[PDB]
């Protein structure tokens, strides 16, 4: 949204594990709040999608994603775990192109960085949805993930938590849907 970005900041002060290891999606620091605008950035690029551009800058969405892998390789880096052994595996239903792909920037590669940014931004278009037209698809779809994620972020306008376990599981939910909803070969217009 027009304030998402700002809603990532806000989740921003809430301080919480002071090494505030990638845990709960958030941060604290300065570098953290350049980083933050990147999840806002995601969105902007990928509207002209929406129908068919031709004439703009779609090449400008595989080069943003390219310099997002960066951050992404350091999630990899961790002294191995779960979920981030399972995010991995989220590489595998998000990628397609394969036995019929277009020489390029890899375009498949380049949708599995996508995903990393989002999430609060993901968070900021279903606030939208309530308040403009209708589809209670995605919000269906979007349910699930959405619940579990959204209240425990919640907690953090008070303060964070110490690091709940629990809480790294609703960061992958919420990045699985993503994709699957920018498919949806409708909507994502509404603009004129």
Request: proline share 4%; hydrophobic share 60%.
């Amino acid at each position: 949204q027009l304030m998402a970005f700002a809603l990532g900041i806000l989740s921003v002060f809430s301080p919480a594990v002071l090494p505030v290891v990638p845990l709960i999606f958030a941060g604290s620091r300065g570098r953290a709040l350049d980083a933050f605008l990147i999840v806002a950035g995601l969105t902007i690029s990928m509207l002209i999608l929406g129908y068919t551009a031709s004439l703009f800058f779609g090449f400008f969405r595989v080069v943003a994603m390219l310099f997002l892998l960066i951050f992404a390789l350091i999630l990899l880096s961790d002294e191995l775990d779960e979920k981030v052994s399972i995010f991995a595996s989220r590489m595998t239903s998000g990628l397609s192109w394969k036995i019929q792909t277009l020489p390029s920037f890899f375009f498949g590669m380049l949708l599995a960085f996508l995903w990393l940014p989002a999430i609060l931004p993901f968070a900021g278009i279903a606030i939208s949805q309530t308040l403009l037209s209708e589809n209670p698809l995605v919000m269906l779809s979007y349910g699930l993930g959405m619940a579990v994620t959204i209240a425990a972020v919640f907690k953090m306008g008070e303060k964070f938590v110490k690091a709940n376990f629990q809480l790294i599981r609703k960061v992958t939910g919420a990045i699985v849907l993503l994709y699957l909803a920018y498919f949806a070969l409708t909507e994502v217009l509404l603009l004129e």
